Amino acid sequence: NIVLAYGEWPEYCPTRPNRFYTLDSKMWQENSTGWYWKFPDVLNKTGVFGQNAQFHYLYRSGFCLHVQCNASKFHQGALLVAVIPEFVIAGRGPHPGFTTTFPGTTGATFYDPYVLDSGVPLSQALIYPHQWINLRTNNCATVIVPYINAVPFDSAINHSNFGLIVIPVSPLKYSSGATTAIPITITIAPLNSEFGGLR
Amino acid sequence: NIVLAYGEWPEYCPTRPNRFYTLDSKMWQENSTGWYWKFPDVLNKTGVFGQNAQFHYLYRSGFCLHVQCNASKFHQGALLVAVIPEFVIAGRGPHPGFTTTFPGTTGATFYDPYVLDSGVPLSQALIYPHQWINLRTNNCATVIVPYINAVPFDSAINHSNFGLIVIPVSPLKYSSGATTAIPITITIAPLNSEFGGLR
Amino acid sequence: NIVLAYGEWPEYCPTRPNRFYTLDSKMWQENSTGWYWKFPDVLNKTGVFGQNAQFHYLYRSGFCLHVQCNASKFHQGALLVAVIPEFVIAGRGPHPGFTTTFPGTTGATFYDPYVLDSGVPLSQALIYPHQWINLRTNNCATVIVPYINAVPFDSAINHSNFGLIVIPVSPLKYSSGATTAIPITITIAPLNSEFGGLR
Amino acid sequence: VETILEVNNTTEATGLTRLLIPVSSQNKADELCAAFMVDPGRIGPWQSTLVGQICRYYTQWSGSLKVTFMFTGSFMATGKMLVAYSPPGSAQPANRETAMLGTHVIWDFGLQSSVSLVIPWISNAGVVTLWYQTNYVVPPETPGEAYIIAMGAAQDNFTLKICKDTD
Amino acid sequence: LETTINHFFSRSGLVGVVNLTDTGYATWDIDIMGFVQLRRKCEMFTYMRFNAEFTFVTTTERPYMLQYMYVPPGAPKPTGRDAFQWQTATNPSVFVKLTDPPAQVSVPFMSPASAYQWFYDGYPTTTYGLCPNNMMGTFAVRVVSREASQLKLQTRVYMKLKHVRAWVPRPIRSQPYLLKNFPNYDSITNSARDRSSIKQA
């Protein structure tokens, strides 16, 4: 069921400070094309973690995710939940800017999903720890992500550890009379956070 | 679940030569009226068994059947799978001919199902090993048939051991918008074949 | 008596499917000059082996041969039964073609036997497993041939494993009144065949 | 690693719609839904997967590839498929009957949502198809179109030989 | 009990009615499918096996030495009352006077297959469903005199079935049939007689 990213169970070896956060649910239409979030940025200016990541400039944590979409038995389609480390938006054309690369809690959208906006084709995106949300089998997906970085610490504001992508591969078709949009809610919980140094 | 025809588990007491064959699925409409096949004729000119029944003129085998129709939860109706030994088409009016009595893999259809085209009323057809395919309980049926003949051997081409009938007793009703036809696929596997003599 | 080709007793290490085949007897006159057959081609379109070599495209077998000519006590002459691996017709003059290299069951004839139609002189042809049919000592010859190939498998149609040659070294002389021709019949039996893959 | 295989690589595909095989609801029985060669390295369907990129290196390959499908319809739909296969001796079959005699796997929809198929011992063709073998059955007020995306991977005995630069 | 299958066949009913003029003789094929009371009770099953015994009852309109020959299946049938088939010793015949109490004889089970088949679906290679392994023979009743019989006699043939064993059943016939040895029915009558409505039993 659950998918350990590379099999770690993230422990830690600077104090050691777990509420289930809930991002705001995106609506999924017929002509939608995907989303991405770039953790651990979206937890900033939010909650007690936001007061622990904005003032401290060393950081290490691991996460537990739960992507869950609720659909009735009269819809169809299949998503793709992948967790990409060091996920870099390329920029078309000419650099992409700042409000495109750090979207905050409102996760930004894609332009060209076939190349993942980085020249990397989607056919091979399953190297990353993936989990198919197929709407005729289940309605949930759960990924546990350890702390994946070369240096054992970093700043919380600048460097993003990884990203989370949600891509509609097969488009949503529905007979007339049903609701047009399907929500997608996400749950984020830090597992073993360990901050250091106060400013 | 499965129905042994008269409780045999067909063994054998001439060499002893099992692929799951699959006949082509018939479409079932509202005004359809039934089908029949007359084994072991339909396995001729088909597969390695066809190359073992056309050249050899002594024969003994038993069969395992699997009649399976796939219907959604918005249809209704009930079929009737019976296995009649020495099933003889009578002929109306005036003998029926040849392409009516040996239909090949395309199983022929009925004219008057109420009398089974032999003067035998359908009310008493459950003497034979029967199995109700009721479309609100299941979608499969399985009959195992031994070798039922007075002489211990026969030719494969001429003499038919038995027949298989599929009769829509309650007609299929469906609300508008659903698909008009429902397929019926059949699986045939020889159990203990034992041929003899090569020509 | 019997001559093992290089001493193997051919075992095998893809299913594992032995009738004594009999090729059609060639007539040997005064001015005849030899024959060749190029196994395992001549068993194609013949018998149950032909239905197992035309449909399967991997192959391994060994053979047992029996070349036998029946002559009375008033004739004379001596043949030469040799088994040449990878026997290649050269072509005079300008490639030889197809109906010359693959003769089928009617084994093709020689043009110049002194050089074996390949530039190889007959004086040294006894390197191959040979057996003299001298018509004042015996009337039979028997060669057992294993599977001799670099790759452990091949196709049955394209690649020929070896060839069988029959050469009249001393010509046949006979006093007047005797029969002009002497037959030569050949028996072929596969020893350990092992096919693989069906098309 | 099972990666997504491009099958619908026609001219008019143009986007994510080339990652999926269409399944109608008006196709008559036994008409070929899709067909492609089993050739990790030749210019075609395998050129998008992860096998097809790391075998543009390593000139000589040999092994046992497997092919996985999965279905993307509503829960109420029900049908069957006949995933067939032929050895590289012959071409693809024509009818449902002459394809049934091979290495078929009768895959349906009401029970299983995914199926695999083990292809034995390729080297440096072999053709896989899939046939309908029944109608595609829908209840009313249900969209009657779905797609089947394919996968691709290599099992344990998949070995390589002499290195070679790519493209 | 009396619902066992041996008691269900153990009555000796009429089969065929044969009369002879003086031609001079009269033959009769053996078949149980002559009357509808015995056909509906014997298309019940598919495979049967039984020995039979007979009885010949003679009604003129004194005693003569009339005989009853028997033809095993394969032997040729007589053509005239003074042909050479009447003296072949391989045909077992029964000499019985008129005024005596009636003749009685048993017949063993002669089919080549283990049991008789009342339904065959195939061919011997209009020849559909005619299994030749149901032949049981004739009787060829003949009055014996040197010439000029002049009786105008009529015989009746009864039949009892013994030691019978039946295999796989079939449902009964529900319609009258036209031909003698075929189930042709000329499409239709129902099975249950009608009433007024679905209610009101």
mmCIF file of N, CA, C and O in Angstrom, chain E residues 127-201:
data_model
loop_
_atom_site.group_PDB
_atom_site.id
_atom_site.type_symbol
_atom_site.label_atom_id
_atom_site.label_comp_id
_atom_site.label_asym_id
_atom_site.label_seq_id
_atom_site.Cartn_x
_atom_site.Cartn_y
_atom_site.Cartn_z
ATOM 1 N N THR E 127 -30.146 -40.494 -44.382
ATOM 2 C CA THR E 127 -29.449 -41.445 -43.525
ATOM 3 C C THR E 127 -29.090 -40.825 -42.185
ATOM 4 O O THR E 127 -28.057 -41.153 -41.598
ATOM 5 N N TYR E 128 -29.926 -39.921 -41.700
ATOM 6 C CA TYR E 128 -29.687 -39.200 -40.462
ATOM 7 C C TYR E 128 -30.453 -39.890 -39.346
ATOM 8 O O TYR E 128 -31.687 -39.918 -39.358
ATOM 9 N N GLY E 129 -29.729 -40.443 -38.383
ATOM 10 C CA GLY E 129 -30.373 -41.050 -37.238
ATOM 11 C C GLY E 129 -31.022 -42.386 -37.508
ATOM 12 O O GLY E 129 -32.102 -42.667 -36.975
ATOM 13 N N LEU E 130 -30.395 -43.223 -38.327
ATOM 14 C CA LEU E 130 -30.860 -44.585 -38.567
ATOM 15 C C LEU E 130 -29.727 -45.509 -38.156
ATOM 16 O O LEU E 130 -28.894 -45.890 -38.982
ATOM 17 N N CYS E 131 -29.693 -45.865 -36.882
ATOM 18 C CA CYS E 131 -28.677 -46.780 -36.390
ATOM 19 C C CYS E 131 -29.032 -48.198 -36.809
ATOM 20 O O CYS E 131 -30.110 -48.683 -36.453
ATOM 21 N N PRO E 132 -28.168 -48.895 -37.550
ATOM 22 C CA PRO E 132 -28.515 -50.246 -38.010
ATOM 23 C C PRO E 132 -28.476 -51.295 -36.916
ATOM 24 O O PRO E 132 -28.853 -52.441 -37.177
ATOM 25 N N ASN E 133 -28.040 -50.947 -35.708
ATOM 26 C CA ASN E 133 -27.870 -51.904 -34.632
ATOM 27 C C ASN E 133 -29.129 -52.102 -33.802
ATOM 28 O O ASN E 133 -29.034 -52.512 -32.642
ATOM 29 N N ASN E 134 -30.303 -51.816 -34.359
ATOM 30 C CA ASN E 134 -31.565 -52.087 -33.689
ATOM 31 C C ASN E 134 -32.353 -53.191 -34.373
ATOM 32 O O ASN E 134 -33.515 -53.419 -34.023
ATOM 33 N N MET E 135 -31.753 -53.875 -35.341
ATOM 34 C CA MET E 135 -32.449 -54.935 -36.050
ATOM 35 C C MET E 135 -32.619 -56.142 -35.143
ATOM 36 O O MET E 135 -31.670 -56.572 -34.484
ATOM 37 N N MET E 136 -33.832 -56.681 -35.097
ATOM 38 C CA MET E 136 -34.108 -57.867 -34.309
ATOM 39 C C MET E 136 -34.710 -59.005 -35.113
ATOM 40 O O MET E 136 -34.771 -60.127 -34.602
ATOM 41 N N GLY E 137 -35.166 -58.756 -36.339
ATOM 42 C CA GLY E 137 -35.583 -59.829 -37.220
ATOM 43 C C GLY E 137 -37.055 -59.867 -37.566
ATOM 44 O O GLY E 137 -37.772 -58.885 -37.372
ATOM 45 N N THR E 138 -37.513 -60.996 -38.107
ATOM 46 C CA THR E 138 -38.909 -61.157 -38.493
ATOM 47 C C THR E 138 -39.515 -62.394 -37.854
ATOM 48 O O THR E 138 -38.909 -63.001 -36.968
ATOM 49 N N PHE E 139 -40.705 -62.771 -38.284
ATOM 50 C CA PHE E 139 -41.231 -64.059 -37.855
ATOM 51 C C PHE E 139 -41.755 -64.932 -38.984
ATOM 52 O O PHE E 139 -41.575 -66.148 -38.916
ATOM 53 N N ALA E 140 -42.388 -64.348 -40.006
ATOM 54 C CA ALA E 140 -42.791 -65.031 -41.242
ATOM 55 C C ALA E 140 -43.723 -66.219 -40.963
ATOM 56 O O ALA E 140 -43.354 -67.383 -41.107
ATOM 57 N N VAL E 141 -44.925 -65.882 -40.501
ATOM 58 C CA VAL E 141 -45.933 -66.888 -40.182
ATOM 59 C C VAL E 141 -46.366 -67.606 -41.453
ATOM 60 O O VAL E 141 -46.656 -66.971 -42.472
ATOM 61 N N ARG E 142 -46.382 -68.934 -41.408
ATOM 62 C CA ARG E 142 -46.759 -69.753 -42.551
ATOM 63 C C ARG E 142 -47.599 -70.926 -42.088
ATOM 64 O O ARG E 142 -47.222 -71.624 -41.144
ATOM 65 N N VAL E 143 -48.732 -71.139 -42.741
ATOM 66 C CA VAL E 143 -49.497 -72.363 -42.543
ATOM 67 C C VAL E 143 -48.845 -73.461 -43.369
ATOM 68 O O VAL E 143 -48.375 -73.221 -44.484
ATOM 69 N N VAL E 144 -48.728 -74.657 -42.800
ATOM 70 C CA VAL E 144 -48.023 -75.747 -43.458
ATOM 71 C C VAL E 144 -49.038 -76.733 -43.995
ATOM 72 O O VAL E 144 -49.790 -77.348 -43.230
ATOM 73 N N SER E 145 -49.050 -76.877 -45.313
ATOM 74 C CA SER E 145 -49.745 -77.956 -45.993
ATOM 75 C C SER E 145 -49.068 -78.131 -47.338
ATOM 76 O O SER E 145 -48.205 -77.341 -47.726
ATOM 77 N N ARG E 146 -49.466 -79.180 -48.053
ATOM 78 C CA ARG E 146 -48.843 -79.436 -49.342
ATOM 79 C C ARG E 146 -49.380 -78.494 -50.413
ATOM 80 O O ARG E 146 -48.612 -78.002 -51.246
ATOM 81 N N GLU E 147 -50.684 -78.224 -50.395
ATOM 82 C CA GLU E 147 -51.280 -77.195 -51.236
ATOM 83 C C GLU E 147 -52.619 -76.804 -50.636
ATOM 84 O O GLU E 147 -53.168 -77.521 -49.795
ATOM 85 N N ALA E 148 -53.126 -75.648 -51.086
ATOM 86 C CA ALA E 148 -54.521 -75.223 -50.933
ATOM 87 C C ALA E 148 -54.940 -75.137 -49.460
ATOM 88 O O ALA E 148 -55.732 -75.937 -48.959
ATOM 89 N N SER E 149 -54.348 -74.164 -48.774
ATOM 90 C CA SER E 149 -54.597 -73.986 -47.348
ATOM 91 C C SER E 149 -56.036 -73.567 -47.062
ATOM 92 O O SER E 149 -56.794 -74.349 -46.477
ATOM 93 N N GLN E 150 -56.415 -72.364 -47.512
ATOM 94 C CA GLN E 150 -57.780 -71.818 -47.452
ATOM 95 C C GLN E 150 -58.299 -71.726 -46.012
ATOM 96 O O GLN E 150 -59.216 -72.436 -45.600
ATOM 97 N N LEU E 151 -57.670 -70.830 -45.250
ATOM 98 C CA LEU E 151 -58.046 -70.588 -43.861
ATOM 99 C C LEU E 151 -58.605 -69.197 -43.606
ATOM 100 O O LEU E 151 -59.634 -69.075 -42.935
ATOM 101 N N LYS E 152 -57.938 -68.156 -44.114
ATOM 102 C CA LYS E 152 -58.188 -66.743 -43.804
ATOM 103 C C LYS E 152 -58.067 -66.501 -42.294
ATOM 104 O O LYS E 152 -59.024 -66.213 -41.578
ATOM 105 N N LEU E 153 -56.834 -66.667 -41.832
ATOM 106 C CA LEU E 153 -56.472 -66.624 -40.426
ATOM 107 C C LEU E 153 -55.806 -65.296 -40.077
ATOM 108 O O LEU E 153 -55.182 -64.651 -40.921
ATOM 109 N N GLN E 154 -55.957 -64.887 -38.819
ATOM 110 C CA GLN E 154 -55.390 -63.647 -38.307
ATOM 111 C C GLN E 154 -54.710 -63.919 -36.978
ATOM 112 O O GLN E 154 -55.337 -64.445 -36.055
ATOM 113 N N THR E 155 -53.442 -63.549 -36.872
ATOM 114 C CA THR E 155 -52.678 -63.736 -35.651
ATOM 115 C C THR E 155 -52.512 -62.412 -34.922
ATOM 116 O O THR E 155 -52.710 -61.337 -35.489
ATOM 117 N N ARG E 156 -52.155 -62.503 -33.644
ATOM 118 C CA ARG E 156 -51.838 -61.341 -32.827
ATOM 119 C C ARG E 156 -50.566 -61.625 -32.051
ATOM 120 O O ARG E 156 -50.373 -62.736 -31.557
ATOM 121 N N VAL E 157 -49.702 -60.626 -31.930
ATOM 122 C CA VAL E 157 -48.385 -60.805 -31.338
ATOM 123 C C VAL E 157 -48.293 -59.963 -30.080
ATOM 124 O O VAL E 157 -48.420 -58.735 -30.141
ATOM 125 N N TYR E 158 -48.049 -60.612 -28.948
ATOM 126 C CA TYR E 158 -47.841 -59.937 -27.677
ATOM 127 C C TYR E 158 -46.368 -59.958 -27.310
ATOM 128 O O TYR E 158 -45.580 -60.728 -27.856
ATOM 129 N N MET E 159 -45.998 -59.094 -26.370
ATOM 130 C CA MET E 159 -44.594 -58.879 -26.042
ATOM 131 C C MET E 159 -44.465 -58.510 -24.578
ATOM 132 O O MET E 159 -45.115 -57.571 -24.125
ATOM 133 N N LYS E 160 -43.606 -59.217 -23.856
ATOM 134 C CA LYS E 160 -43.258 -58.864 -22.489
ATOM 135 C C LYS E 160 -41.773 -58.544 -22.410
ATOM 136 O O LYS E 160 -40.950 -59.254 -22.991
ATOM 137 N N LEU E 161 -41.432 -57.483 -21.690
ATOM 138 C CA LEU E 161 -40.047 -57.075 -21.514
ATOM 139 C C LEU E 161 -39.549 -57.529 -20.151
ATOM 140 O O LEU E 161 -40.236 -57.353 -19.145
ATOM 141 N N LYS E 162 -38.356 -58.116 -20.118
ATOM 142 C CA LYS E 162 -37.827 -58.695 -18.893
ATOM 143 C C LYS E 162 -36.395 -58.240 -18.658
ATOM 144 O O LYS E 162 -35.662 -57.955 -19.607
ATOM 145 N N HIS E 163 -36.025 -58.173 -17.370
ATOM 146 C CA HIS E 163 -34.673 -57.857 -16.893
ATOM 147 C C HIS E 163 -34.177 -56.501 -17.376
ATOM 148 O O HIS E 163 -32.982 -56.323 -17.609
ATOM 149 N N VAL E 164 -35.070 -55.540 -17.527
ATOM 150 C CA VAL E 164 -34.742 -54.308 -18.231
ATOM 151 C C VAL E 164 -33.896 -53.410 -17.336
ATOM 152 O O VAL E 164 -34.039 -53.407 -16.109
ATOM 153 N N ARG E 165 -32.939 -52.713 -17.946
ATOM 154 C CA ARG E 165 -32.070 -51.761 -17.272
ATOM 155 C C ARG E 165 -32.013 -50.503 -18.122
ATOM 156 O O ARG E 165 -31.750 -50.583 -19.322
ATOM 157 N N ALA E 166 -32.253 -49.352 -17.513
ATOM 158 C CA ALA E 166 -32.300 -48.110 -18.265
ATOM 159 C C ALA E 166 -31.209 -47.156 -17.812
ATOM 160 O O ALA E 166 -30.837 -47.120 -16.638
ATOM 161 N N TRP E 167 -30.714 -46.373 -18.756
ATOM 162 C CA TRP E 167 -29.749 -45.313 -18.520
ATOM 163 C C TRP E 167 -30.375 -43.984 -18.924
ATOM 164 O O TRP E 167 -31.580 -43.919 -19.165
ATOM 165 N N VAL E 168 -29.527 -42.959 -19.041
ATOM 166 C CA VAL E 168 -29.802 -41.520 -18.924
ATOM 167 C C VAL E 168 -31.146 -41.044 -19.469
ATOM 168 O O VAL E 168 -31.533 -41.389 -20.593
ATOM 169 N N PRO E 169 -31.908 -40.298 -18.683
ATOM 170 C CA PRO E 169 -33.298 -40.014 -19.042
ATOM 171 C C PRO E 169 -33.413 -38.826 -19.981
ATOM 172 O O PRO E 169 -32.478 -38.062 -20.193
ATOM 173 N N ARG E 170 -34.606 -38.690 -20.538
ATOM 174 C CA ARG E 170 -34.990 -37.613 -21.435
ATOM 175 C C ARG E 170 -36.415 -37.231 -21.077
ATOM 176 O O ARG E 170 -37.143 -38.040 -20.493
ATOM 177 N N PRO E 171 -36.838 -36.010 -21.383
ATOM 178 C CA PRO E 171 -38.225 -35.640 -21.109
ATOM 179 C C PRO E 171 -39.163 -36.245 -22.138
ATOM 180 O O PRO E 171 -38.761 -36.641 -23.232
ATOM 181 N N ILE E 172 -40.440 -36.303 -21.761
ATOM 182 C CA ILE E 172 -41.426 -37.002 -22.568
ATOM 183 C C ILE E 172 -41.809 -36.179 -23.789
ATOM 184 O O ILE E 172 -41.623 -34.963 -23.848
ATOM 185 N N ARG E 173 -42.384 -36.862 -24.770
ATOM 186 C CA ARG E 173 -42.917 -36.194 -25.946
ATOM 187 C C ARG E 173 -44.218 -35.501 -25.571
ATOM 188 O O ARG E 173 -45.010 -36.025 -24.786
ATOM 189 N N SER E 174 -44.428 -34.303 -26.111
ATOM 190 C CA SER E 174 -45.609 -33.522 -25.786
ATOM 191 C C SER E 174 -46.480 -33.210 -26.988
ATOM 192 O O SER E 174 -47.531 -32.583 -26.822
ATOM 193 N N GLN E 175 -46.077 -33.609 -28.183
ATOM 194 C CA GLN E 175 -46.855 -33.337 -29.376
ATOM 195 C C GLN E 175 -47.047 -34.617 -30.169
ATOM 196 O O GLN E 175 -46.230 -35.536 -30.071
ATOM 197 N N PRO E 176 -48.127 -34.720 -30.941
ATOM 198 C CA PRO E 176 -48.239 -35.842 -31.869
ATOM 199 C C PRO E 176 -47.204 -35.721 -32.963
ATOM 200 O O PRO E 176 -46.745 -34.629 -33.301
ATOM 201 N N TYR E 177 -46.827 -36.868 -33.503
ATOM 202 C CA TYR E 177 -45.766 -36.959 -34.490
ATOM 203 C C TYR E 177 -46.312 -37.550 -35.777
ATOM 204 O O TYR E 177 -47.191 -38.415 -35.753
ATOM 205 N N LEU E 178 -45.797 -37.053 -36.896
ATOM 206 C CA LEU E 178 -46.307 -37.481 -38.187
ATOM 207 C C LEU E 178 -45.671 -38.792 -38.622
ATOM 208 O O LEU E 178 -46.358 -39.804 -38.787
ATOM 209 N N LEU E 179 -44.356 -38.789 -38.802
ATOM 210 C CA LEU E 179 -43.676 -39.926 -39.391
ATOM 211 C C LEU E 179 -43.490 -41.032 -38.363
ATOM 212 O O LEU E 179 -43.710 -40.853 -37.164
ATOM 213 N N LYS E 180 -43.069 -42.196 -38.850
ATOM 214 C CA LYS E 180 -42.993 -43.355 -37.975
ATOM 215 C C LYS E 180 -41.728 -43.353 -37.128
ATOM 216 O O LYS E 180 -41.782 -43.656 -35.934
ATOM 217 N N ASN E 181 -40.585 -43.016 -37.710
ATOM 218 C CA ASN E 181 -39.326 -43.155 -36.994
ATOM 219 C C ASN E 181 -38.559 -41.848 -36.974
ATOM 220 O O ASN E 181 -37.330 -41.829 -37.068
ATOM 221 N N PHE E 182 -39.266 -40.730 -36.850
ATOM 222 C CA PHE E 182 -38.637 -39.423 -36.807
ATOM 223 C C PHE E 182 -39.475 -38.509 -35.931
ATOM 224 O O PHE E 182 -40.702 -38.640 -35.902
ATOM 225 N N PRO E 183 -38.854 -37.582 -35.214
ATOM 226 C CA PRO E 183 -39.614 -36.727 -34.295
ATOM 227 C C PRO E 183 -40.286 -35.518 -34.932
ATOM 228 O O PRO E 183 -40.575 -34.561 -34.210
ATOM 229 N N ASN E 184 -40.495 -35.517 -36.250
ATOM 230 C CA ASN E 184 -41.035 -34.350 -36.944
ATOM 231 C C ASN E 184 -42.446 -34.023 -36.469
ATOM 232 O O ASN E 184 -43.270 -34.913 -36.263
ATOM 233 N N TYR E 185 -42.724 -32.729 -36.294
ATOM 234 C CA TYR E 185 -43.907 -32.316 -35.557
ATOM 235 C C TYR E 185 -44.813 -31.305 -36.246
ATOM 236 O O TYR E 185 -45.902 -31.049 -35.718
ATOM 237 N N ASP E 186 -44.406 -30.723 -37.381
ATOM 238 C CA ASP E 186 -45.234 -29.860 -38.238
ATOM 239 C C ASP E 186 -45.746 -28.630 -37.481
ATOM 240 O O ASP E 186 -46.921 -28.518 -37.126
ATOM 241 N N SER E 187 -44.802 -27.747 -37.178
ATOM 242 C CA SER E 187 -45.093 -26.477 -36.520
ATOM 243 C C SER E 187 -46.070 -25.604 -37.304
ATOM 244 O O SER E 187 -47.249 -25.518 -36.957
ATOM 245 N N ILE E 188 -48.328 -26.691 -33.975
ATOM 246 C CA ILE E 188 -47.944 -26.504 -32.582
ATOM 247 C C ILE E 188 -49.151 -26.591 -31.671
ATOM 248 O O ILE E 188 -50.114 -25.852 -31.836
ATOM 249 N N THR E 189 -49.095 -27.496 -30.705
ATOM 250 C CA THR E 189 -50.051 -27.513 -29.614
ATOM 251 C C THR E 189 -49.339 -27.175 -28.313
ATOM 252 O O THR E 189 -48.110 -27.222 -28.217
ATOM 253 N N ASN E 190 -50.125 -26.818 -27.310
ATOM 254 C CA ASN E 190 -49.574 -26.440 -26.022
ATOM 255 C C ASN E 190 -49.391 -27.680 -25.157
ATOM 256 O O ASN E 190 -49.476 -28.817 -25.627
ATOM 257 N N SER E 191 -49.125 -27.467 -23.876
ATOM 258 C CA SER E 191 -48.998 -28.544 -22.907
ATOM 259 C C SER E 191 -50.109 -28.543 -21.871
ATOM 260 O O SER E 191 -50.666 -29.599 -21.572
ATOM 261 N N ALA E 192 -50.442 -27.383 -21.321
ATOM 262 C CA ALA E 192 -51.495 -27.259 -20.330
ATOM 263 C C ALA E 192 -52.687 -26.532 -20.926
ATOM 264 O O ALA E 192 -52.526 -25.543 -21.646
ATOM 265 N N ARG E 193 -53.881 -27.025 -20.623
ATOM 266 C CA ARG E 193 -55.094 -26.387 -21.107
ATOM 267 C C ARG E 193 -55.328 -25.069 -20.380
ATOM 268 O O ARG E 193 -54.965 -24.906 -19.214
ATOM 269 N N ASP E 194 -55.935 -24.125 -21.085
ATOM 270 C CA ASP E 194 -56.035 -22.774 -20.567
ATOM 271 C C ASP E 194 -57.138 -22.650 -19.527
ATOM 272 O O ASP E 194 -58.016 -23.504 -19.398
ATOM 273 N N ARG E 195 -57.067 -21.556 -18.774
ATOM 274 C CA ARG E 195 -58.127 -21.143 -17.869
ATOM 275 C C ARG E 195 -58.479 -19.700 -18.203
ATOM 276 O O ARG E 195 -58.014 -19.179 -19.219
ATOM 277 N N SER E 196 -59.293 -19.046 -17.375
ATOM 278 C CA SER E 196 -59.748 -17.699 -17.706
ATOM 279 C C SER E 196 -58.633 -16.677 -17.531
ATOM 280 O O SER E 196 -58.228 -16.011 -18.489
ATOM 281 N N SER E 197 -58.119 -16.541 -16.310
ATOM 282 C CA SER E 197 -57.162 -15.494 -15.987
ATOM 283 C C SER E 197 -56.020 -16.086 -15.176
ATOM 284 O O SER E 197 -56.003 -17.278 -14.858
ATOM 285 N N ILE E 198 -55.054 -15.232 -14.833
ATOM 286 C CA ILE E 198 -53.963 -15.665 -13.972
ATOM 287 C C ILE E 198 -54.440 -15.786 -12.529
ATOM 288 O O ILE E 198 -53.918 -16.601 -11.762
ATOM 289 N N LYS E 199 -55.468 -15.036 -12.150
ATOM 290 C CA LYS E 199 -56.059 -15.168 -10.833
ATOM 291 C C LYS E 199 -57.084 -16.299 -10.851
ATOM 292 O O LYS E 199 -57.217 -17.028 -11.840
ATOM 293 N N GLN E 200 -57.814 -16.437 -9.736
ATOM 294 C CA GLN E 200 -59.031 -17.248 -9.623
ATOM 295 C C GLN E 200 -58.760 -18.727 -9.919
ATOM 296 O O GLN E 200 -59.166 -19.270 -10.946
ATOM 297 N N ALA E 201 -58.011 -19.341 -9.010
ATOM 298 C CA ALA E 201 -57.661 -20.757 -9.117
ATOM 299 C C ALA E 201 -58.877 -21.677 -9.105
ATOM 300 O O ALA E 201 -59.066 -22.469 -10.027
#
